[PDB]
Write a protein that binds this DNA or RNA. Structure first.
Lengths: 215, 211
DNA sequence: CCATGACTGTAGGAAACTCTAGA
DNA sequence: CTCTAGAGTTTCCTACAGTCATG
């Protein structure tokens, strides 16, 4: 789309510009937005006056103002103004948002695990993340890839029905090669969709690898 | 205090420092502006006519949809992180308006050497703060009291808006033997060095000869 | 408890787009 | 008037410091 992209953190105010508009009223411009809150298309005016005045209100200078963002606010936003006269200008905005979960935690982590077979190593958990994002395992600071050599991950995403946010869980199990590193290091790393931010790592776990009793 | 500036009609958002981004929070915005009878304290829920002027956002930031001369003042936010954590934000606020382009009026088509002439009156409209007016001859600016060079200047504030109108009337005694096709201009040098100066179109009267 | 490290948060600077002035 | 050019304004990226967690 002619739409330019905008991304904002959840809870913070956003302010959009109406291209080529009178800086002081009286002004003629009308915003159009289809989003989570809009049933289909909501048209907003310099006067405002609906229930939207505590949500989205056109400023005296023509820009569109949102006191604090929320997930439902994701969508497209457009404006049409008249530069007198009769010059006329457009705006096309795609708006996405995000939230950052707390530092991921580990749970159900093996005191010690044994070689030659699968083991339940533990589970990472991240809460309050948007958009969803992901959990990646690292052995000694290197990546752990599924389907390959006894490495497995039991995964889910749980959306808080109220906050519309995500609770994350990743359970790792591994079959160690007999005769491997006896004190290997695992970590877990949450990453979001864009470079909207960096990566969060869990405090590692340095379990003890015990060998199988001979037969 | 952190110095701040913005255009009249523009929105303004002040970030409360060290305070929870989501409500509820414990914080206090107390300020003194041209809209205040004294120090004024606006709360999380705020209230009064102030909601139409400056309002507190769910994330703790104070906000003005349209700032005006009436709003130049002091803004302090004493906030509580959780307990009893405390950090205090401090701002100093100057504002401005860019006036209409400068104009010379009553400018001379002809003028005579050896005595004074009315060159013209450079006139600016709709400025805040008021600022200064200067003249220049063929690229270089001029000074009063030097070799028969004088100025009648004034400033006036439109009552409704509060902006300013400056008049500058230029007068000189031309040297006999100088430039018969001289070019003069006026320039508005704003109070706050926000933008570069604005200069009138030139005027190239013809120096004529007495006896 | 003290020293150390890591993080959140904020301060300053640089680059990009938009508007204004001029030909 | 359509086009060219120089600032102005806003924005993102980068960096230093304060603050919280940790050994």
């Amino acid at each position: 789309v002619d739409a330019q992209n905008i991304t904002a953190r959840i809870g913070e105010p956003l302010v959009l510009k109406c291209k080529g508009a009178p800086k002081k009223p009286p002004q003629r411009l009308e915003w159009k937005l289809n989003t989570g809150r809009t049933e289909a298309w909501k048209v907003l005016s310099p006067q405002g006056g609906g229930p939207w005045d505590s949500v989205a209100r056109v400023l005296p200078n023509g820009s569109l103002f949102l006191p604090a963002v929320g997930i439902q606010d994701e969508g497209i936003f457009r404006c049409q103004a008249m530069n007198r006269n009769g010059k006329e200008t457009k705006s096309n905005y795609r708006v996405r948002v995000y939230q950052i979960p707390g530092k991921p935690e580990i749970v159900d982590s093996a005191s010690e695990l044994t070689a030659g077979v699968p083991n339940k190593v533990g589970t990472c958990v991240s809460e309050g993340s948007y958009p969803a994002g992901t959990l990646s395992w690292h052995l000694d600071g290197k990546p752990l890839v599924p389907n390959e050599k006894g490495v497995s991950v039991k995964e889910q995403t749980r959306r808080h029905p109220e906050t519309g946010l995500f609770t994350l869980q990743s359970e790792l199990m591994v079959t160690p090669a007999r005769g491997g590193d006896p004190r290997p290091t695992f970590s877990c790393s949450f990453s979001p969709g864009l470079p909207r931010h960096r990566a969060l790592r869990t405090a590692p776990i340095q379990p003890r690898v015990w060998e199988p009793v001979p037969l």
